[PDB]
Structure 1
Amino acid sequence: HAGLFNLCVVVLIAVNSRLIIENLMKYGWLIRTDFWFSSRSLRDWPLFMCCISLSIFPLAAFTVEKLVLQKYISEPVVIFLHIIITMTEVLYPVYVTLRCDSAFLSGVTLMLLTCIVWLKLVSYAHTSYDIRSLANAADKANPEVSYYVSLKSLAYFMVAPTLCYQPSYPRSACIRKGWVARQFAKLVIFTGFMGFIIEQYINPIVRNSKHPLKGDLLYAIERVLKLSVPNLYVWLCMFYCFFHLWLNILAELLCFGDREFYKDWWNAKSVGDYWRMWNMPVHKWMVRHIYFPCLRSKIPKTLAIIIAFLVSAVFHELCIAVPCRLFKLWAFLGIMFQVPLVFITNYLQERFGSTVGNMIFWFIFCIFGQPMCVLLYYHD
């Protein structure tokens, strides 16, 4: 069934083929300019070696786990230590990306690694607290603790493309190395295709006069789809590069038991259905750590969805607005608009059809969607 997905790059080689064949070798006129990392030689940036400076805090979580598992201090004190460790995870890399500053894309990938490491840390803390509360009911404890293997399990969880820590993981085989290279080659060519389609389509169409949109929109609703359809293909190729290619490569090199991350997000009859569908690991993180602890007792789901999307709004604002240090709160409000939207398109999809719900999903994803974040990300 893969040829109709395959046709979407045939028509991108085919339309403006001429501006594809004017390059010398591997986009010789557009190299290290789009999806760019300047000075590929040496490749030593003081935030790139500070991308491994956030790895001393998983070691700090292992030291406070060693304090509570060798009975150095009580459980509440360690919980406070986890709270301060994951708030230093907020406060320290924003100080890294403001003071002794660097490029915007390096700041964006540092904030994305900060967000992913924060989820991985909070999931490690919640799973360690759950297995400590399970193990303290009886006097079984844990003989043969194997702190090298626990260190390797925590570090292997930190490089893993999932956000749910277990000490025992499903594994696979790493004998297919030509496949790994083929996926990497597919990723690099798409990256070059990403830079080509950003420089040829979005960059001449954003670089003009623009105005902030209002409640009334007369003769201005044609721009929010015409400047969003190449952004729709940019987000589709971003999804294919991250969730189908890079996460599958990082699953394969670490020998992961499930390449399960992307799951059926194109047949979304509504958003809300879409946000529970579009990636497995962060949706498993919300249904394991925030929504379902709210749904254990005394909070219903009709504020749990708002507080889960509030912390997702906080993560998107920390990912986008902080490396540009402008504090727009446009991705915050643009995804806070989605939270009444999930409820709306559910009232619209009731007494209706799934097909026209998918039509209005792709319209919602066109205008008030995730390519809007890339549009505001290429508007600074």
Structure 2
Amino acid sequence: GRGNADATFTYRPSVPAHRRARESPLSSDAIFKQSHAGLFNLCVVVLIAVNSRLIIENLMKYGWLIRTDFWFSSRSLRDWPLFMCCISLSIFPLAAFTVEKLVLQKYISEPVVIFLHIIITMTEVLYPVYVTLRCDSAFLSGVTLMLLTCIVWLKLVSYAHTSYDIRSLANAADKANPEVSYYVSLKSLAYFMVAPTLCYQPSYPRSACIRKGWVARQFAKLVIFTGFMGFIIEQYINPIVRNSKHPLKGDLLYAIERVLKLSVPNLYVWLCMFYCFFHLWLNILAELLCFGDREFYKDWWNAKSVGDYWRMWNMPVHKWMVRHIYFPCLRSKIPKTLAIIIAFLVSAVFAELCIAVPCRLFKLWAFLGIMFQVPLVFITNYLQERFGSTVGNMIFWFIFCIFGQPMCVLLYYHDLMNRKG
């Protein structure tokens, strides 16, 4: 035919076929200086075949498990006592604003301000916890209420500390510009409480305008990916978790097989959760509010260790811990390792709150898992220095996406089922 090789002018069989002594491939170091694209294309083809076999085997065993009443039903008893609390979480920054105005005119002293701030933040933590504990609602409503409570707590602590620092620099060094209009101050606080950031500033860099078609397109992608995530949770995660036993009570091999079976759709749900929250929703929120800065994350998938992942997975939380926990501890002559223990302790307490308060279980799995990250940072740093970056990134994937999250899902689900009966 056409031919993608040497020309077709005939040489006779009396002409020899062997004239030079060569050497076979994979028997010399010259094979390493060549691109082997097919060896990764083979892995991609094997992955597609494996996932296709899993889909066909799950469909043959179970069938269509999708129901119209699984996610959103007519049980609206969960809605009204907690969503009202969601609106009732907006009275705590205004109270804080009143305290700040009380120190702006010379009416009260500084320790009274710190004591009042502790009262407002503590009441803000304790009241939704009591509301969620007294009622009986779904998991999702409680998770949403706890996440909003944690975000409002971080904003209040950041606003109070940054306002004290601005007041302390404006009173000590040089006194200028006294008594700025209450409406501009209320507008800045109200703008900060809805913006996609956790650090308070009086003003922020802005963008051009609102692109309505862009916001509509990102919203359409967000609803499609959320529906895809719900389908993967209902059709694939639910059979595996119903058909298991407790991992700490039973055979070891059976528990390892259940964790390895749960590892793949959990990883898919994790990537979809990151793309839905940290990319789509924050950009839609920034576009509506004309928020200029949009560095909400970095390339965390190229992490060379556990500490690399914790440095680049979440930009607002990392900037909040650097500004409000790490640097005040460093200024007070405390060592570095104590600062990493205090920061991970704050993270472990709030993660334990968000997971355990809807579940109504005092099992400290999530607390121990966040608190175990402190020796893991040093161990993966030593391993990455000794062995390289590829082996460090593989150790990070094995620890995070293969072992930890399915084990947490199985422990919390089975503890909840043992609580109910």
Whether TM-score is above 0.5 comes out as: yes
User: Structure 1, residues 100-158: CA drift from partner, whole Å, max 9, x if none?
Assistant: 34322101100000001100111111111110111111442433512111111111111
In 1: Cα distance, 2:94 partner to 2:48 partner: 48
Secondary structure at the counterpart of residue 290 of structure 1: helix
* Residues 144 and 371 (structure 1), Cα distance of their counterparts in 2 relative to 1, 3 Å cut: farther
CA contact (8 A) 1:34 1:195 kept: no
In 2: Cα distance, 1:60 partner to 1:3 partner: 64
Match of 2:203 among 152, 156, 168: 168
CA contact (8 A) 1:112 1:319 kept: yes
| Alpha-carbon shift at residue 247 of structure 1 (Å) | 1.0
Instruction: Verify: 1:307 aligned to 2:342, yes or no.
Output: yes
More deviation in 213-222 or 141-150?
213-222
In 1: Cα distance, 2:212 partner to 2:408 partner: 36
In 2: Cα distance, 1:20 partner to 1:194 partner: 15
| Alpha-carbon shift at residue 36 of structure 1 (Å) | 2.8
CA contact (8 A) 2:65 2:235 kept: no
* Residues 368 and 300 (structure 1), Cα distance of their counterparts in 2 relative to 1, 3 Å cut: farther
| Alpha-carbon shift at residue 14 of structure 1 (Å) | 11
| Alpha-carbon shift at residue 96 of structure 1 (Å) | 1.3
In 1: Cα distance, 2:178 partner to 2:70 partner: 50
* Residues 5 and 352 (structure 1), Cα distance of their counterparts in 2 relative to 1, 3 Å cut: closer
Using the size of structure 1 for normalisation, the TM-score is 0.88
* Residues 53 and 344 (structure 1), Cα distance of their counterparts in 2 relative to 1, 3 Å cut: same
CA contact (8 A) 1:231 1:375 kept: no
CA contact (8 A) 2:240 2:258 kept: no
| Alpha-carbon shift at residue 378 of structure 1 (Å) | 5.3
* Residues 15 and 175 (structure 1), Cα distance of their counterparts in 2 relative to 1, 3 Å cut: farther
In 2: Cα distance, 1:300 partner to 1:65 partner: 32
CA contact (8 A) 2:240 2:262 kept: yes
In 2: Cα distance, 1:116 partner to 1:273 partner: 24
User: Structure 1, residues 262-309: CA drift from partner, whole Å, max 9, x if none?
Assistant: 211111111011111101000111111111211113211111111111
* Residues 144 and 72 (structure 1), Cα distance of their counterparts in 2 relative to 1, 3 Å cut: closer
Secondary structure at the counterpart of residue 58 of structure 2: coil
In 2: Cα distance, 1:308 partner to 1:88 partner: 22
CA contact (8 A) 1:35 1:191 kept: no
* Residues 41 and 104 (structure 1), Cα distance of their counterparts in 2 relative to 1, 3 Å cut: closer
Secondary structure at the counterpart of residue 259 of structure 1: coil
User: Structure 1, residues 159-203: CA drift from partner, whole Å, max 9, x if none?
Assistant: 011000001101113331111011111111111001100011110
Secondary structure at the counterpart of residue 51 of structure 1: helix
CA contact (8 A) 1:228 1:372 kept: no
Q: What residue is the counterpart of 1:186 in the other structure?
A: 221
Greater Rg over alpha carbons, structure: 2
In 2: Cα distance, 1:10 partner to 1:49 partner: 51
In 1: Cα distance, 2:336 partner to 2:136 partner: 41
Instruction: Verify: 1:320 aligned to 2:355, yes or no.
Output: yes
In 2: Cα distance, 1:300 partner to 1:101 partner: 44
* Residues 161 and 45 (structure 1), Cα distance of their counterparts in 2 relative to 1, 3 Å cut: same
Secondary structure at the counterpart of residue 139 of structure 1: coil
| Alpha-carbon shift at residue 98 of structure 1 (Å) | 1.4
CA contact (8 A) 2:352 2:367 kept: yes
More deviation in 181-190 or 20-29?
20-29
| Alpha-carbon shift at residue 21 of structure 1 (Å) | 14
Secondary structure at the counterpart of residue 55 of structure 1: coil
User: Structure 1, residues 18-40: CA drift from partner, whole Å, max 9, x if none?
Assistant: 99999999999988868834449
In 1: Cα distance, 2:68 partner to 2:158 partner: 37
In 2: Cα distance, 1:5 partner to 1:39 partner: 49
CA contact (8 A) 1:232 1:366 kept: yes
In 2: Cα distance, 1:3 partner to 1:276 partner: 35
Q: What residue is the counterpart of 1:373 in the other structure?
A: 408
* Residues 4 and 55 (structure 1), Cα distance of their counterparts in 2 relative to 1, 3 Å cut: farther
In 2: Cα distance, 1:262 partner to 1:10 partner: 31
* Residues 55 and 87 (structure 1), Cα distance of their counterparts in 2 relative to 1, 3 Å cut: same
Structure 2: tracts of 5 or more residues without a match: 1-35, 416-421
| Alpha-carbon shift at residue 339 of structure 1 (Å) | 2.1
* Residues 368 and 103 (structure 1), Cα distance of their counterparts in 2 relative to 1, 3 Å cut: same
In 2: Cα distance, 1:81 partner to 1:243 partner: 34
More deviation in 215-224 or 114-123?
215-224
More deviation in 33-42 or 240-249?
33-42
Q: What residue is the counterpart of 1:129 in the other structure?
A: 164
More deviation in 292-301 or 175-184?
292-301
* Residues 35 and 209 (structure 1), Cα distance of their counterparts in 2 relative to 1, 3 Å cut: closer
Q: How many residues align?
A: 380
In 2: Cα distance, 1:17 partner to 1:183 partner: 29
* Residues 48 and 20 (structure 1), Cα distance of their counterparts in 2 relative to 1, 3 Å cut: farther
More deviation in 356-365 or 338-347?
338-347
Q: Is the helix fraction higher in 1 or 2?
A: 2
| Alpha-carbon shift at residue 370 of structure 1 (Å) | 4.9
User: Structure 1, residues 32-75: CA drift from partner, whole Å, max 9, x if none?
Assistant: 86883444999952211210111100011101001111122001
User: Structure 1, residues 328-369: CA drift from partner, whole Å, max 9, x if none?
Assistant: 111111222222211211111112211111111111112454
* Residues 125 and 31 (structure 1), Cα distance of their counterparts in 2 relative to 1, 3 Å cut: farther
More deviation in 194-203 or 211-220?
211-220
* Residues 32 and 47 (structure 1), Cα distance of their counterparts in 2 relative to 1, 3 Å cut: farther
CA contact (8 A) 1:232 1:371 kept: no
* Residues 238 and 220 (structure 1), Cα distance of their counterparts in 2 relative to 1, 3 Å cut: same
* Residues 322 and 349 (structure 1), Cα distance of their counterparts in 2 relative to 1, 3 Å cut: same
User: Structure 1, residues 224-265: CA drift from partner, whole Å, max 9, x if none?
Assistant: 232122101101100000000111111111111111112111
In 1: Cα distance, 2:39 partner to 2:77 partner: 41
